[PDB]
Amino acid sequence: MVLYFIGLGLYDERDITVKGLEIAKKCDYVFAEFYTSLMAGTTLGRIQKLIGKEIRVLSREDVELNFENIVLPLAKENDVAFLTPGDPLVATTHAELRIRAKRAGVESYVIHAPSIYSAVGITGLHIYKFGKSATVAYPEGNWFPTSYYDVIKENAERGLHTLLFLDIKAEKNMYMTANEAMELLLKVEDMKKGGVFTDDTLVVVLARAGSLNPTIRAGYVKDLIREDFGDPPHILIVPGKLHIVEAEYLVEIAGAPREILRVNV
Amino acid sequence: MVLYFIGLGLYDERDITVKGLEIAKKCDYVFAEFYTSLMAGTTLGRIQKLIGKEIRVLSREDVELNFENIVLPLAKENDVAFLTPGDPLVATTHAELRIRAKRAGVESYVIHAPSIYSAVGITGLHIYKFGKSATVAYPEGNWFPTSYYDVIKENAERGLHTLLFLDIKAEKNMYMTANEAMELLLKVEDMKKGGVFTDDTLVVVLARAGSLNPTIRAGYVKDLIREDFGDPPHILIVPGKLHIVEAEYLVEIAGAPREILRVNV
Numbered sequence: 178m179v180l181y182f183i184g185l186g187l188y189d190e191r192d193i194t195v196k197g198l199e200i201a202k203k204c205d206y207v208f209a210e211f212y213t214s215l216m217a218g219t220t221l222g223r224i225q226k227l228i229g230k231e232i233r234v235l236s237r238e239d240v241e242l243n244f245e246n247i248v249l250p251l252a253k254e255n256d257v258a259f260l261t262p263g264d265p266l267v268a269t270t271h272a273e274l275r276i277r278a279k280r281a282g283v284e285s286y287v288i289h290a291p292s293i294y295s296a297v298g299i300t301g302l303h304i305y306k307f308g309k310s311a312t313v314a315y316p317e318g319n320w321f322p323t324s325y326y327d328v329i330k331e332n333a334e335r336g337l338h339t340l341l342f343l344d345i346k347a348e349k350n351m352y353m354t355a356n357e358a359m360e361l362l363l364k365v366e367d368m369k370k371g372g373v374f375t376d377d378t379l380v381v382v383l384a385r386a387g388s389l390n391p392t393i394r395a396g397y398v399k400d401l402i403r404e405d406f407g408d409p410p411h412i413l414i415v416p417g418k419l420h421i422v423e424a425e426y427l428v429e430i431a432g433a434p435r436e437i438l439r440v441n442v
Numbered sequence: 443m444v445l446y447f448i449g450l451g452l453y454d455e456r457d458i459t460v461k462g463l464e465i466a467k468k469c470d471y472v473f474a475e476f477y478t479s480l481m482a483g484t485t486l487g488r489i490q491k492l493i494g495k496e497i498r499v500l501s502r503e504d505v506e507l508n509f510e511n512i513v514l515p516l517a518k519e520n521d522v523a524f525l526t527p528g529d530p531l532v533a534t535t536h537a538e539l540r541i542r543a544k545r546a547g548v549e550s551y552v553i554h555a556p557s558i559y560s561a562v563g564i565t566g567l568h569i570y571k572f573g574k575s576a577t578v579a580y581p582e583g584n585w586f587p588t589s590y591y592d593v594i595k596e597n598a599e600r601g602l603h604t605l606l607f608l609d610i611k612a613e614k615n616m617y618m619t620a621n622e623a624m625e626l627l628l629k630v631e632d633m634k635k636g637g638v639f640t641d642d643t644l645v646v647v648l649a650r651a652g653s654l655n656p657t658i659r660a661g662y663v664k665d666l667i668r669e670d671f672g673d674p675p676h677i678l679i680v681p682g683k684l685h686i687v688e689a690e691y692l693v694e695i696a697g698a699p700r701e702i703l704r705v706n707v
């Protein structure tokens with residue numbers, strides 16, 4: 178008996194690691210959630226075909242409120258796998274599920290998969306230069322989230338890049354675009370007026386990482402705010418001070434304005 | 443006409459993604475580099491057997507000085523794969539290779555795989571709370587680098603965690619242990635006296651991420667400095683203030699002392 182947390186990766190069913198696949202194929206029961214992220218290059222059917230098992234999809238409520246009632250019971254007498262997009266423990270609250278497993282007397286194992294958190298390396302920005310990360314959440318009712326703005330401010334003051342996860346409402350089939358995130362940031366800027374995010378701010382957009390042809394674009398907010406970056410998911414990055422080689426890659430690979438090559442040391 | 447940058451993942455030969463494996467199998471030539479890091483849980487022979495292709499290993503010089511003479515010429519008229527440990531382009535020097543490909547008229551695509559940068563999520567520490575990353579380098583001769591100490595200081599004062607990559611002499615298959623890293627940090631503290639790393643500092647050690655049996659341990663330096671964390675590779679993390687959920691995971695999963703629930707939250 179055992180419970181495996183297995184990541185499926187960034188874009189399609191083949192982003193799962195060989196290790197994850199060989200283990201999932203031999204499990205007795207397979208569960209999964211698809212609300213923490215969007216795998217734009219595959220379908221439940223294609224994933225089921227690859228693993229050769231029927232997959233029971235769980236909702237956020239099933240997991241957060243009933244993981245110990247739906248999954249763990251079976252894990253006490255069978256080999257069970259719980260699949261998630263990307264890496265199962267990145268930008269999710271699934272780590273806490275391992276504590277539930279322990280209390281239920283179930284041993285758990287984690288199988289990693291490519292995560293957007295490290296895939297941003299394809300933007301050419303040095304991974305070690307990324308600071309604190311944040312999530313741009315959709316405003317709801319009278320509540321308008323703004324914490325992500327302070328994160329950018331804090332990182333930028335230290336010359337660090339800021340990775341911005343974008344909101345997702347899987348049940349409503351809503352996936353926040355980089356465009357919508359930029360619009361929200363501009364509104365927060367008008368409020369706090371910190372000079373953190375304006376029309377002249379350089380940003381980087383990465384869409385559908387994991388696919389063979391992801392959209393990688395760099396430029397000023399005023400020019401990219403209404404640009405079509407293709408289907409979701411999207412992630413937005415606000416670079417800090419750039420190293421020359423970072424600027425070169427942004428220009429050569431992400432189509433950034435050649436003027437950024439002239440860094441102000 | 444195509445060059446594929448393919449990540450091998452975290453630890454052994456099954457950490458490559460299904461996508462990376464199937465693409466590599468289809469390539470006419472397969473190259474690999476093991477100087478940015480090593481794949482401690484496998485061997486070149488096992489990787490070759492899995493891919494079913496002869497693998498030409500390239501040294502740091504082969505790549506940095508002659509990538510365009512060794513790899514690109516073949517990629518100009520064949521499908522070529524370039525394997526790297528972890529996730530491609532996380533290593534800072536990798537990105538520029540895509541520019542070389544472009545200059546040579548060769549198309550390049552990136553096939554991601556798990557990176558230690560994202561795998562640290564298995565420590566229970568929230569990914570968004572990680573700040574700037576650093577590498578602990580062995581001192582030598584009259585050179586005593588200490589920039590990694592400053593990184594911890596700046597992250598911690600902002601309540602952020604610090605991921606510390608440990609020194610590796612790939613060519614010599616030699617790894618710096620978390621124990622050695624802690625001893626070095628205590629030495630730096632004795633020199634700078636910034637109150638950044640002491641016997642009372644809480645640290646987290648993650649060894650052999652990617653394995654089904656990684657070592658995940660959390661506790662105070664005074665107690666972990668001489669503890670055996672198993673075979674390499676080791677990663678050291680100096681958490682910033684903890685969210686109670688992070689602390690509870692460290693206690694339940696990483697064997698942290700109950701004391702962290704009142705001292706580090």
Ligand SMILES: Nc1ncnc2c1ncn2[C@@H]1O[C@H](CSCC[C@H](N)C(=O)O)[C@@H](O)[C@H]1O
Pocket residue numbers: 187188213214215262263264265266267268269291292293294341342343344345383384385386387410411412413
């Ligand atoms: N392939 C992809 N391309 C671009 N952004 C992606 C992405 N996959 C995830 N994201 C981003 O991350 C958000 C989900 S956060 C959950 C991330 C997941 N555990 C992982 O390891 O990747 C999305 O709303 C989106 O903004």
